Design a protein around this motif. Sequence first.
Motif, PDB file in Angstrom:
ATOM      1  N   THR A  22       0.820  -1.205   0.000  1.00 33.63           N
ATOM      2  CA  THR A  22       0.000   0.000   0.000  1.00 33.63           C
ATOM      3  C   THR A  22       0.855   1.256   0.000  1.00 33.63           C
ATOM      4  O   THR A  22       0.475   2.262  -0.614  1.00 33.63           O
ATOM      5  N   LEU A  23       2.018   1.222   0.653  1.00 30.04           N
ATOM      6  CA  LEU A  23       2.894   2.383   0.584  1.00 30.04           C
ATOM      7  C   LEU A  23       3.298   2.669  -0.852  1.00 30.04           C
ATOM      8  O   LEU A  23       3.320   3.826  -1.280  1.00 30.04           O
ATOM      9  N   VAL A  24       3.621   1.627  -1.616  1.00 28.22           N
ATOM     10  CA  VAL A  24       3.953   1.843  -3.022  1.00 28.22           C
ATOM     11  C   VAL A  24       2.738   2.342  -3.790  1.00 28.22           C
ATOM     12  O   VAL A  24       2.839   3.258  -4.612  1.00 28.22           O
ATOM     13  N   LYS A  25       1.572   1.752  -3.534  1.00 23.02           N
ATOM     14  CA  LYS A  25       0.370   2.114  -4.277  1.00 23.02           C
ATOM     15  C   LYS A  25      -0.011   3.568  -4.065  1.00 23.02           C
ATOM     16  O   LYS A  25      -0.664   4.171  -4.921  1.00 23.02           O
ATOM     17  N   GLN A  26       0.388   4.150  -2.939  1.00 22.74           N
ATOM     18  CA  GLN A  26       0.019   5.533  -2.668  1.00 22.74           C
ATOM     19  C   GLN A  26       0.638   6.520  -3.647  1.00 22.74           C
ATOM     20  O   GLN A  26       0.226   7.682  -3.662  1.00 22.74           O
ATOM     21  N   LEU A  27       1.619   6.106  -4.448  1.00 20.69           N
ATOM     22  CA  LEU A  27       2.248   7.032  -5.384  1.00 20.69           C
ATOM     23  C   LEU A  27       1.285   7.512  -6.457  1.00 20.69           C
ATOM     24  O   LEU A  27       1.472   8.600  -7.009  1.00 20.69           O
ATOM     25  N   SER A  28       0.271   6.724  -6.783  1.00 20.79           N
ATOM     26  CA  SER A  28      -0.594   7.055  -7.902  1.00 20.79           C
ATOM     27  C   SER A  28      -1.698   8.034  -7.542  1.00 20.79           C
ATOM     28  O   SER A  28      -2.477   8.408  -8.421  1.00 20.79           O
ATOM     29  N   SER A  29      -1.790   8.452  -6.287  1.00 21.17           N
ATOM     30  CA  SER A  29      -2.862   9.338  -5.876  1.00 21.17           C
ATOM     31  C   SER A  29      -2.597  10.761  -6.347  1.00 21.17           C
ATOM     32  O   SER A  29      -1.510  11.110  -6.804  1.00 21.17           O
ATOM     33  N   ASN A  30      -3.625  11.591  -6.225  1.00 21.72           N
ATOM     34  CA  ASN A  30      -3.629  12.953  -6.737  1.00 21.72           C
ATOM     35  C   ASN A  30      -3.459  14.003  -5.657  1.00 21.72           C
ATOM     36  O   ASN A  30      -2.814  15.025  -5.894  1.00 21.72           O
ATOM     37  N   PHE A  31      -4.049  13.784  -4.486  1.00 23.76           N
ATOM     38  CA  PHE A  31      -3.974  14.714  -3.364  1.00 23.76           C
ATOM     39  C   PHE A  31      -4.471  16.102  -3.743  1.00 23.76           C
ATOM     40  O   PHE A  31      -4.054  17.100  -3.157  1.00 23.76           O
ATOM     41  N   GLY A  32      -5.368  16.184  -4.715  1.00 21.34           N
ATOM     42  CA  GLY A  32      -5.944  17.453  -5.095  1.00 21.34           C
ATOM     43  C   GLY A  32      -5.174  18.243  -6.127  1.00 21.34           C
ATOM     44  O   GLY A  32      -5.625  19.328  -6.510  1.00 21.34           O
ATOM     45  N   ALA A  33      -4.030  17.750  -6.588  1.00 18.81           N
ATOM     46  CA  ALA A  33      -3.320  18.414  -7.666  1.00 18.81           C
ATOM     47  C   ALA A  33      -3.978  18.078  -9.000  1.00 18.81           C
ATOM     48  O   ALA A  33      -5.012  17.412  -9.062  1.00 18.81           O
ATOM     49  N   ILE A  34      -3.376  18.545 -10.091  1.00 14.18           N
ATOM     50  CA  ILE A  34      -3.944  18.291 -11.409  1.00 14.18           C
ATOM     51  C   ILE A  34      -3.477  16.975 -12.013  1.00 14.18           C
ATOM     52  O   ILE A  34      -4.116  16.474 -12.948  1.00 14.18           O
ATOM     53  N   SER A  35      -2.384  16.406 -11.519  1.00 15.55           N
ATOM     54  CA  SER A  35      -1.896  15.140 -12.040  1.00 15.55           C
ATOM     55  C   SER A  35      -1.029  14.476 -10.987  1.00 15.55           C
ATOM     56  O   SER A  35      -0.555  15.119 -10.050  1.00 15.55           O
ATOM     57  N   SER A  36      -0.822  13.177 -11.161  1.00 20.49           N
ATOM     58  CA  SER A  36      -0.056  12.378 -10.222  1.00 20.49           C
ATOM     59  C   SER A  36       1.392  12.186 -10.639  1.00 20.49           C
ATOM     60  O   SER A  36       2.113  11.436  -9.980  1.00 20.49           O
ATOM     61  N   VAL A  37       1.835  12.829 -11.713  1.00 21.84           N
ATOM     62  CA  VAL A  37       3.200  12.692 -12.201  1.00 21.84           C
ATOM     63  C   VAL A  37       3.822  14.076 -12.330  1.00 21.84           C
ATOM     64  O   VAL A  37       3.179  15.018 -12.802  1.00 21.84           O
ATOM     65  N   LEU A  38       5.071  14.203 -11.880  1.00 25.15           N
ATOM     66  CA  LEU A  38       5.727  15.504 -11.886  1.00 25.15           C
ATOM     67  C   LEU A  38       6.011  15.995 -13.295  1.00 25.15           C
ATOM     68  O   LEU A  38       5.994  17.206 -13.539  1.00 25.15           O
ATOM     69  N   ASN A  39       6.290  15.084 -14.225  1.00 21.25           N
ATOM     70  CA  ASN A  39       6.687  15.505 -15.562  1.00 21.25           C
ATOM     71  C   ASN A  39       5.576  16.283 -16.254  1.00 21.25           C
ATOM     72  O   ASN A  39       5.834  17.317 -16.877  1.00 21.25           O
ATOM     73  N   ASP A  40       4.337  15.805 -16.154  1.00 18.81           N
ATOM     74  CA  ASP A  40       3.230  16.506 -16.796  1.00 18.81           C
ATOM     75  C   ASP A  40       3.019  17.881 -16.186  1.00 18.81           C
ATOM     76  O   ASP A  40       2.818  18.865 -16.905  1.00 18.81           O
ATOM     77  N   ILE A  41       3.069  17.970 -14.859  1.00 21.78           N
ATOM     78  CA  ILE A  41       2.892  19.259 -14.205  1.00 21.78           C
ATOM     79  C   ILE A  41       3.978  20.223 -14.645  1.00 21.78           C
ATOM     80  O   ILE A  41       3.714  21.399 -14.917  1.00 21.78           O
ATOM     81  N   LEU A  42       5.215  19.744 -14.725  1.00 16.39           N
ATOM     82  CA  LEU A  42       6.308  20.612 -15.142  1.00 16.39           C
ATOM     83  C   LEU A  42       6.156  21.041 -16.594  1.00 16.39           C
ATOM     84  O   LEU A  42       6.423  22.198 -16.935  1.00 16.39           O
ATOM     85  N   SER A  43       5.721  20.133 -17.459  1.00 20.42           N
ATOM     86  CA  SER A  43       5.696  20.392 -18.890  1.00 20.42           C
ATOM     87  C   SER A  43       4.396  21.020 -19.365  1.00 20.42           C
ATOM     88  O   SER A  43       4.260  21.282 -20.562  1.00 20.42           O
ATOM     89  N   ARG A  44       3.436  21.254 -18.477  1.00 24.14           N
ATOM     90  CA  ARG A  44       2.184  21.863 -18.890  1.00 24.14           C
ATOM     91  C   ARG A  44       1.847  23.149 -18.152  1.00 24.14           C
ATOM     92  O   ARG A  44       0.746  23.671 -18.338  1.00 24.14           O
ATOM     93  N   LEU A  45       2.749  23.672 -17.325  1.00 25.48           N
ATOM     94  CA  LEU A  45       2.477  24.897 -16.591  1.00 25.48           C
ATOM     95  C   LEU A  45       3.767  25.678 -16.393  1.00 25.48           C
ATOM     96  O   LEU A  45       4.864  25.117 -16.431  1.00 25.48           O
ATOM     97  N   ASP A  46       3.616  26.979 -16.189  1.00 27.58           N
ATOM     98  CA  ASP A  46       4.716  27.840 -15.796  1.00 27.58           C
ATOM     99  C   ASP A  46       5.021  27.662 -14.311  1.00 27.58           C
ATOM    100  O   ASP A  46       4.192  27.144 -13.558  1.00 27.58           O
ATOM    101  N   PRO A  47       6.202  28.081 -13.864  1.00 27.18           N
ATOM    102  CA  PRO A  47       6.620  27.831 -12.472  1.00 27.18           C
ATOM    103  C   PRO A  47       5.648  28.348 -11.420  1.00 27.18           C
ATOM    104  O   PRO A  47       5.438  27.656 -10.411  1.00 27.18           O
ATOM    105  N   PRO A  48       5.034  29.537 -11.582  1.00 32.41           N
ATOM    106  CA  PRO A  48       4.288  30.106 -10.441  1.00 32.41           C
ATOM    107  C   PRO A  48       3.237  29.196  -9.820  1.00 32.41           C
ATOM    108  O   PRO A  48       3.109  29.191  -8.591  1.00 32.41           O
ATOM    109  N   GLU A  49       2.485  28.426 -10.608  1.00 28.90           N
ATOM    110  CA  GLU A  49       1.534  27.487 -10.024  1.00 28.90           C
ATOM    111  C   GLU A  49       2.033  26.052 -10.036  1.00 28.90           C
ATOM    112  O   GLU A  49       1.526  25.221  -9.263  1.00 28.90           O
TER     113      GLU A  49
END
Lengths: 49, 49
Positions: A22-49
Amino acid sequence: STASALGKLQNVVNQNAQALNTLVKQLSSNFGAISSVLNDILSRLDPPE
Amino acid sequence: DSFVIRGDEVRQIAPGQTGKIADYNYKLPDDFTGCVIAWNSNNLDSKVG
């Protein structure tokens, strides 16, 4: 012949495995962000948000 | 730091701002501390010619 006579040791093994799984499985959650992977967040938004 | 720009461009002078002047002429750091002052000069800096 009879099984299920060693419930305690099997129980310990199962508990450890389940906690790790379950600790490993928790990686796929969202926690209220727009995505569960850092690469998409970095590549689809400017730094401020 | 002093300069002159048009009326519409003053909104680009802010931390973490994207546009045309903010990225090609004057870029402010995201964690900027300080203040920004803007006033009119159409009666002094504008020429009929």
